[PDB]
Design a protein around this nucleic acid. Structure first.
Ligand SMILES: [Ca+2]
Ligand SMILES: [Ca+2]
Ligand SMILES: [Ca+2]
Ligand SMILES: [Mg+2]
Ligand SMILES: [Mg+2]
Ligand SMILES: [Mg+2]
Length: 759
DNA sequence: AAACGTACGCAGTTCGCG
DNA sequence: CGCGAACTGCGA
């Protein structure tokens, strides 16, 4: 089983290292024969003697071409002749790259920016995470002493907890009387003891939650301040910090650092992603949270530290439990893509597509297109195209609604119509498929590059969905529902990759052909169900639509819907298929992207409403939820109007807990890049002068107080709110939070804001 | 060195023009 | 002084 690959340099030569786990034993295989290379397209073969003489320099090393070789390849399915240029060290490629491209006889260069370790995995046909080997796992978490305005890791680490199959333990240097706590003398002894535990346990996988940005960087700064060699790698090395766009990433040589946070962010949809929220969302059970102020208070006063150790132990225990459930899913993704679990777990969906396309290109002798240059990148950014069809809904409260959905609409269109840049506007084909409105024709004689790969991906989704019904365990059901939704997003991201400005296989024509076909298929399906089956489409987005037959019972709508499904699916060709997704007793459609329906089991589902958004106060969400329940489940409009009146009364009388008035908004840039200033930005600028570091990703939690000026003038952070001296802006939360979230719903019954507010 | 798939959409905050 | 627009955050 291949776990990871990298390369080291021995006497100026690269040495590929393959970290493996075969027969329960860890092994490092070495390879000194793999040669870095990139391709070049020449105006004439006679010029190869000049390109061989082109040199460059990196550090104090002279870079030359080691060997050339003429190769017969394909570029988007067309025969092409390129020259394969070999080199000694992979770092020779970036040093000599542009000089070779700048030669007047070199048309272009190709495949010049592929990392050496990933190139090895592709060229040798190696698939990581392959086999039945059982990987040992060990999770850990840290608890630190934090104070406002201090530098990062200025205070010491207080506790280090770890968990595996043997249980969970906490190492700390203050005496805490608990059977799972090991007490040492100093912070240095604690870090050394944890380092020994890892060396003795020798886990293949180190599991963290946000270890890429906090736990590992905190341990590093603390180790260099205390002069500790943080030797965690199986080669005796220290954890290495890497840069991936905005955030950082930590790797441990010889092992797999599995950070759950990027995985959970791609797998589950939650309002907040604290460890306690993720744990309760997966295992249904609550987890207590202890904040850094209570940790610092308990440590410095010496009172209440058992509660802190319990929170630290549960942090490691829960992180291990979540790592166990989510590793096999990420391991399968590492097999589908063909890259190490470390990269696939934190990779964005764009690179998940491209890394697989790079592997498949090499398998089919297809020369890979280059990443766009600056001029082409800016050009791709400006241009856009039409997307999905969104119908202005029929507003009001409807009954006996069915939702009909297309099964993987965009992937089905790519396969059915062979939408691919190697088939777009090809010449000499016997059969073409022309996209509506945009007129792009596509060859059907042979399976296009991307379409020849989406079928298997869709097949795995149905295999997971089939096991997603035979299972009775809700835990297995949820994890399988999680995994199949992952495959749907990945398969759908193949369409988006066509419009991704950084995509190698960028195809704007392919992208708009997919959406143009999608718009035609749903518009046709809507017209058919209304003309030939007497339905009334109430709302429609990109791949699905709600509909009903007015003045008909639930049974009539169900049988007629199933009948229309037989009709329209016989007309729809290829992989285009409409499914019966659900029936709903009542439904409300506020506007585009804003709806709410209740199924026959009294379960309410909403789309786009304030109930889902995290930038709205809790009192507004709580109020909107109760209103929707009174309308969808009880059908009592006066009870819903009543509820809004009680809330506006309780707010006006200051009887609502200020906790439900907190507004959460994320800072999306540096505080200097803000052209306009709002309540959360104005508060964040106050938090900077108070000592809190503000950066993109920082969530600002503020509350609006009764006062003068703009809302930003009245906004203060919640941690500064004292209910003894501050009276919140009851008028603001009435007029700007509760009332707007419910007025657009209750307007369909004739009610205005004046009829709902308290007087 | 590596670099957030895509379009469509609502709505609060602020503030100057007419 | 109410409208519109620029800005902003987050929502298949
Ligand atoms: Ca739905
Ligand atoms: Ca689907
Ligand atoms: Ca907002
Ligand atoms: Mg690596
Ligand atoms: Mg003390
Ligand atoms: Mg663009």
């Amino acid at each position: 089983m291949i776990l990871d690959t990298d390369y080291i340099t021995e006497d100026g030569k690269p040495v590929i290292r393959i970290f493996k786990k075969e027969n329960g034993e860890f092994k490092i295989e070495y390879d000194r024969t793999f040669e870095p290379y990139f391709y070049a397209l020449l105006k004439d073969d006679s010029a190869i003697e000049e390109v061989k003489k082109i040199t460059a320099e990196r550090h104090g090393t002279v870079v030359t071409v080691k060997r050339v070789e003429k190769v017969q390849k394909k570029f988007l399915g067309r025969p092409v002749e390129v020259w394969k240029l070999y080199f000694t060290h992979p770092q020779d490629v970036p040093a000599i790259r542009d000089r070779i491209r700048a030669h007047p006889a070199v048309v272009d260069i190709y495949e010049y920016d592929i990392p050496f370790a990933k190139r090895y995995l592709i060229d040798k046909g190696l698939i990581p995470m392959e086999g039945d080997e059982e990987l040992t796992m060990l999770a850990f978490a840290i608890a630190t002493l934090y104070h406002e305005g201090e530098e990062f890791a200025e205070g010491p680490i207080l506790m280090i907890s770890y968990a595996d199959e043997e249980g969970a333990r906490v190492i700390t240097w203050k005496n805490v009387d608990l059977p799972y706590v090991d007490v040492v003398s100093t912070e240095r002894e604690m870090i050394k003891r944890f380092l020994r535990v890892v060396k003795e346990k020798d886990p293949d996988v180190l599991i963290t939650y946000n270890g890429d940005n906090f736990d590992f960087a905190y341990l590093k700064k603390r180790c260099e301040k205390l002069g500790i060699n943080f030797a965690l790698g199986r080669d005796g090395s220290e954890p290495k910090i890497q840069r991936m766009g905005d955030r950082f990433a930590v790797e441990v040589k010889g092992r797999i650092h599995f950070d759950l946070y990027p995985v959970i962010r791609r797998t589950i949809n939650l309002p907040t992603y604290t460890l306690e929220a993720v744990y309760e969302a997966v295992f249904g059970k609550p987890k207590e949270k202890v904040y850094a102020e209570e940790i610092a208070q308990a440590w410095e006063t010496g009172e209440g530290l058992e509660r802190v150790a319990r929170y630290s132990m549960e942090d490691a225990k829960v992180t291990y439990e979540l790592g166990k459930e989510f590793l096999p899913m990420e391991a399968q993704l590492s097999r589908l893509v063909g890259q190490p679990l470390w990269d696939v777990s934190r990779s964005s969906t764009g690179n998940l597509v491209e890394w697989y396309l790079l592997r498949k290109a090499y398998e089919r002798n297809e020369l890979a297109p280059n990443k766009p240059d600056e001029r082409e990148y800016e050009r791709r950014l400006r241009e856009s195209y039409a997307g999905g069809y969104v119908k202005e809904p029929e507003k009001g409260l409807w009954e006996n609604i069915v939702y009909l959905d297309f099964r993987s609409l965009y992937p089905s269109i790519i396969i059915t119509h062979n939408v691919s840049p190697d088939t777009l506007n090809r010449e000499g084909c016997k059969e073409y498929d022309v996209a509506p409105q945009v007129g792009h024709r596509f060859c059907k004689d042979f399976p296009g590059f991307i379409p020849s790969l989406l079928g298997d991906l869709l097949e795995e989704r149905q295999k997971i969905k089939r096991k997603m019904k035979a299972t009775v365990d809700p835990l297995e059901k949820k994890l399988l529902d999680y995994r199949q939704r992952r495959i749907k997003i990945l398969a759908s991201s193949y369409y988006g990759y066509y419009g991704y400005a950084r995509a190698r296989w960028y195809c704007k024509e392919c992208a708009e052909s997919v959406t143009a076909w999608g718009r035609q298929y749903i518009e046709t399906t809507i017209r058919e169900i209304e003309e030939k089956f007497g339905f009334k489409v109430l709302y429609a987005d990109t791949d699905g639509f709600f509909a009903t037959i007015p003045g008909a019972d639930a049974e009539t709508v169900k049988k007629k819907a199933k009948e229309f499904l037989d009709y329209i699916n016989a007309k729809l060709p290829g992989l285009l298929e409409l499914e019966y997704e659900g029936f709903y007793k009542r439904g409300f459609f506020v506007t585009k992207k804003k709806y709410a329906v209740i199924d026959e089991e009294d379960k309410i589902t909403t789309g786009g409403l304030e109930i889902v958004r995290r930038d709205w106060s809790e009192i507004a969400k709580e109020t909107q939820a109760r209103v929707l329940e009174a309308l969808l489940k009880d059908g009592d409009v006066e009870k819903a109007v009543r509820i809004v009146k009680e809330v506006t009364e309780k707010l006006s009388k200051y009887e609502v807990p200020p906790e439900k008035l907190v507004i959460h908004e994320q800072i999306t840039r540096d505080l200097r890049d803000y052209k306009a200033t709002g309540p959360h930005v104005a508060v964040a600028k106050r938090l900077a002068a108070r000592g809190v570091k503000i950066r993109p990703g920082t969530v600002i939690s503020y509350i609006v107080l009764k006062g003068s000026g703009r809302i930003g003038d009245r906004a203060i952070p919640f941690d500064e709110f004292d209910p003894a001296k501050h009276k919140y802006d009851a008028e603001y939360y009435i007029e700007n939070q509760v009332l707007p979230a419910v007025e657009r719903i209750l307007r369909a019954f004739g009610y205005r804001k004046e009829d709902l507010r308290y007087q």
